[PDB]
Motif scaffolding. Structure first.
Motif, PDB file in Angstrom:
ATOM      1  N   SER A   1       0.831  -1.196   0.000  1.00  0.00           N
ATOM      2  CA  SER A   1       0.000   0.000   0.000  1.00  0.00           C
ATOM      3  C   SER A   1       0.869   1.251   0.000  1.00  0.00           C
ATOM      4  O   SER A   1       1.838   1.351   0.755  1.00  0.00           O
TER       5      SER A   1
ATOM      6  N   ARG B   1      -9.997   9.166  -7.506  1.00  0.00           N
ATOM      7  CA  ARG B   1      -8.831   8.302  -7.649  1.00  0.00           C
ATOM      8  C   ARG B   1      -7.593   8.941  -7.030  1.00  0.00           C
ATOM      9  O   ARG B   1      -6.776   8.244  -6.416  1.00  0.00           O
TER      10      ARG B   1
ATOM     11  N   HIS C   1      -7.991   8.334  -3.256  1.00  0.00           N
ATOM     12  CA  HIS C   1      -7.604   6.993  -2.834  1.00  0.00           C
ATOM     13  C   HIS C   1      -6.110   6.757  -3.002  1.00  0.00           C
ATOM     14  O   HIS C   1      -5.536   5.922  -2.295  1.00  0.00           O
ATOM     15  N   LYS C   2      -5.463   7.473  -3.924  1.00  0.00           N
ATOM     16  CA  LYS C   2      -4.012   7.379  -4.041  1.00  0.00           C
ATOM     17  C   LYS C   2      -3.322   7.939  -2.804  1.00  0.00           C
ATOM     18  O   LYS C   2      -2.423   7.303  -2.241  1.00  0.00           O
TER      19      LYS C   2
ATOM     20  N   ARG D   1      -4.687   8.655   0.205  1.00  0.00           N
ATOM     21  CA  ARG D   1      -5.142   8.072   1.463  1.00  0.00           C
ATOM     22  C   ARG D   1      -4.167   7.020   1.976  1.00  0.00           C
ATOM     23  O   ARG D   1      -3.975   6.885   3.190  1.00  0.00           O
TER      24      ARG D   1
END
Ligand SMILES: Nc1nc2c(ncn2[C@@H]2O[C@H](COP(=O)(O)OP(=O)(O)O)[C@@H](O)[C@H]2O)c(=O)[nH]1
Ligand SMILES: [Mg+2]
Ligand SMILES: [Mg+2]
Ligand SMILES: [Mg+2]
Ligand SMILES: [Mg+2]
Ligand SMILES: [Mg+2]
Ligand SMILES: [Mg+2]
Ligand SMILES: [Mg+2]
Ligand SMILES: [Mg+2]
Ligand SMILES: [Mg+2]
Ligand SMILES: [Mg+2]
Lengths: 135, 213, 25, 62, 67
Positions: free
Chosen positions: B51, B183, B186-187, B189
């Motif tokens: 991640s 997007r 979410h990148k 985060r």
RNA sequence: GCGUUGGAUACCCACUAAUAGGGAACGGCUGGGUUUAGACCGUCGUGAGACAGGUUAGUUUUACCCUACUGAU
RNA sequence: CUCUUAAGGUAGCCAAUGGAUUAACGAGAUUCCCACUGUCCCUAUCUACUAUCUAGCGAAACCACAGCCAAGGGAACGGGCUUGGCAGAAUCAGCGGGGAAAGAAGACCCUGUUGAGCUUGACUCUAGU
RNA sequence: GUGAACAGCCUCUAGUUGAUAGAAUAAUGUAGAUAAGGGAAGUCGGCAAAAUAGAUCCGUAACUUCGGGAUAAGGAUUGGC
RNA sequence: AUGGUGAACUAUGCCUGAAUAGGGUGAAGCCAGAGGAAACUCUGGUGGAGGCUCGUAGCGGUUCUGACGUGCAAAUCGAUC
């Protein structure tokens, strides 16, 4: 009767009184139709020191030879410049800018010169100014 | 004047990295006797996603040379490395993709990745996806190696510094438009609190020097 | 005024100047 | 530092200097830009005219 | 003021013999029908005049003849 | 004494007997305006900002008191 | 020394296209049309809860003193001053003309101070470098 | 149950029947409706109301980033047995 | 100015949980048929994508010469959104 109100004509006389150069904007589709001959006569009678020129706008809406013929015929009376107003894809911007620089150099005693844009509604005066400023 | 976000980020607080889902720090093995003198063989057990990192990682299991047990290392996966592959690390390791070799033991033009800046720091250069370091040349008298970095810079480092043969996997990631604030959300985060960004001009003069008007 | 080269001006490609929209052919 | 002070700038490039004269403005620039705030009358606590407004003097000329 | 070929290329219509027929054909092709099937003559005419003034129809006045 | 209008956007159109001028402000609802905080364009200013200016959005909520007036014991 | 009016018969050459005259979306700003109607001519009628009367319960704003007018009183401007009109108990429902009657009470100009974690080659400085 | 439906409306189980009351029905209000003929002539301004609306079928333009626009527009129908 | 107290409201990051009817539209992948040397085109299905769409719960708060203004309330109520 729009375009014939006292407030509008007071504004017109104000811009003429404040202008050293006056650009009369004509439509390439109907240049004789969009001419203010009475204003031209008043300028040549009462303010002979103010320099009046023609800008023939919307030349992209006529064939090339029509615009050339109109420029040739109107040059017999006044200096006429073909133009197409746009912020991005315009025509005649450099010619108008260098002509204005010539006027500025001629009036070198004046610290600045004012060029007022007059003509019929919807002929593109604001578009020509936006084209010159690129904004 | 009020403290700007650039100055505020130094105190830590809400600007620390989001590290809950990380697999572990990606490092080479500790430079030991086996890698200094011969080589040691490990096995790629799995290739996993990390991640907040574009490049995948590879879990490589070695045998402990001084005790009966197994040691698990987290390498940055080069392109072409597969599960079940044998990896050789050391001075006597062969010139194959995925092997870890000293920079002095490879010829000119060799493409490496996860390159040590100093011998023993366990990987510092060319770690992002698609990047690599080019071996320009050698200076045997000073025991040095000239390399070219991804930014285009030319550097001189120790010939005992180690590097992994190949190029980091996952290349071409930034060629896809994100298309969406979601997007991007979410990148970042999974990385840190640096999104969205407010322009300084849009602020007040108290908030930022670019403010006002 | 300088030279006004009107051959460097592209006219607007209006729909009424396109032969693909012919009627009665 | 001592290089950016007004005294040092004057050396690099007595009573004639006026307020507001800096690296960007000289005296004529200062007074021309003060024209835009010039036109105000001055009154004291009692209401007497310290200075009349610009172009608003009430004295009758001869 | 406008050429027949230019008008028919712009509005994809033909076969009219007068202005009323032109308006009716354009309204029926564009779906500008009032409640009850009547074509919207005033609305179509206003749109035509707007297009003429704003330059969606090609037209010009002939320059003076050369000497 | 008695009337002095209906509309369009100061001027027109019409009806009409007529479409007279003015005062009690200019010594209750309501739009333009004093419209404070948000925003954009233009001019000036090194800048904070100001303006030759232009556009848009923007809470003030009595009466049961006395008199007057209208009706009622 | 010189400069600009050579372009021609309703769409050109030159590089599908020659574009911001940008689709879609929007409690964004504006104009017009159909339908529709009490917005209006021009107002009328109906229902519920009030208002209203009664039993019980029961505040608040505000209050120099008070409360009918006219004229005149040295800028506008009285309930009180001068001259007049007048003027009969105690009261109920409405009403919004007037009332240092209240609520709008604060905005707007002027003078003198203070602040600005405003800005600049304004002055003394100073962290950092 | 109706209905596409945790919508609206009515019902079973369970639970409430609490909110100062009584008597009259003036004006003015608050909330909700109707209106002959005309149809925005009202007003700064169609503010507010009215009109439309579910489902099935026929049919649907300019423009366009070719994905849309689109439920565009405009028409016909709906019960019971 | 000195020395202390607050992130039970709210601003933001992190950790661990929880919640969100019924419709419309119909992307890729796949099947069959009609063409074609192939690429590929057309027709009918299947499939169920989207910071798509209509619309409850929910979240928010556009508009009304709206209710209220010592109000139920030091920000509430109705409709509309
Ligand atoms: N084709 C074309 N259209 C133009 C040109 N100049 C202006 N227009 C269009 O004319 C319209 C009115 O122009 P505008 O500047 O507002 O006219 P103004 O009244 O003189 O100021 C605008 O919508 C422009 O798109 C031109 O050179 N060519
Ligand atoms: Mg701001
Ligand atoms: Mg403001
Ligand atoms: Mg009495
Ligand atoms: Mg009626
Ligand atoms: Mg009207
Ligand atoms: Mg009227
Ligand atoms: Mg549409
Ligand atoms: Mg908390
Ligand atoms: Mg959505
Ligand atoms: Mg939606």
């Amino acid at each position: 009767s729009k375009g014939q109100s006292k407030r509008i004509w007071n504004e017109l006389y104000k811009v003429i009184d404040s202008s050293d150069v006056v650009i009369h904007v004509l439509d390439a589709r109907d240049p004789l139709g969009t001419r203010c001959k009475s204003v031209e006569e008043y300028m040549k009678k009462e303010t002979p020191h103010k320099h009046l020129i023609y800008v023939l706008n919307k030349c992209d809406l006529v064939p090339t030879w029509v615009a050339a013929a109109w420029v040739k015929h109107l040059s017999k009376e006044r200096p006429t410049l073909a133009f197409h107003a746009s912020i991005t894809n315009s025509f005649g911007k450099g010619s108008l800018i260098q002509l204005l620089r010539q006027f500025s150099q001629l009036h070198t005693d004046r610290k600045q010169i004012s060029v007022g844009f007059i003509g019929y509604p919807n002929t593109g005066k604001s578009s020509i100014i936006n084209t010159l400023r690129k904004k | 004047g009020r403290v700007i976000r650039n100055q505020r980020k130094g105190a830590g607080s809400i600007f620390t990295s989001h590290t809950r889902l990380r697999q572990g720090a990606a490092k080479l093995r500790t430079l030991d006797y086996a890698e200094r003198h011969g080589y040691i063989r490990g096995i790629v057990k799995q290739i996993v996603h990390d991640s907040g990192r574009g490049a995948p990682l590879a879990k490589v299991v070695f045998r402990d040379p001084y005790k009966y047990r197994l040691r698990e290392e987290i390498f940055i996966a080069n392109e072409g490395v597969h599960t079940g592959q044998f990896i050789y690390a050391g001075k006597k390791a062969s010139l194959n993709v995925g092997n870890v070799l000293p920079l002095g033991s490879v010829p000119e033009g060799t493409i490496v990745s996860n390159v040590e800046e100093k011998p023993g720091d366990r990987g510092a250069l060319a770690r992002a996806s698609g990047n690599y370091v080019i071996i320009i040349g050698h200076n045997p008298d000073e025991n040095k190696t000239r390399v070219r970095l991804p930014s285009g810079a030319k550097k001189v480092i120790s010939s005992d510094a180690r590097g992994v043969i190949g190029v980091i996997a996952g290349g071409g990631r930034v060629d896809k438009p994100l298309l969406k604030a979601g997007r991007a959300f979410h990148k970042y985060r999974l990385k840190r609190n640096s999104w969205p960004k407010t322009r300084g001009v849009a602020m007040n003069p108290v908030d930022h020097p670019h403010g006002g008007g | 005024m300088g030279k006004q080269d009107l051959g460097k001006l592209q006219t607007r490609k209006m729909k009424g100047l396109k032969s693909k929209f012919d009627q009665g052919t | 530092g001592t290089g950016k002070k007004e005294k040092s700038r004057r050396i690099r490039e007595g009573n004639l200097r006026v307020k507001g004269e800096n690296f960007y403005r000289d005296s004529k620039r200062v007074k021309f830009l003060n024209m835009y705030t010039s036109g105000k009358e001055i009154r004291n606590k009692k209401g007497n005219l310290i200075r009349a407004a610009s172009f608003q003097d009430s004295t009758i000329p001869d | 003021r406008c050429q027949v070929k230019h008008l028919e290329r712009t509005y994809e219509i033909s076969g009219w013999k007068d202005a009323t027929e032109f308006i009716e054909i354009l309204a029926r092709k564009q779906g500008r029908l009032l409640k009850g099937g009547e074509p919207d003559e005033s609305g179509v005419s206003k749109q035509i005049l707007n297009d003429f003034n704003r330059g969606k129809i090609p037209w010009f006045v002939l320059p003076p003849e050369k000497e």
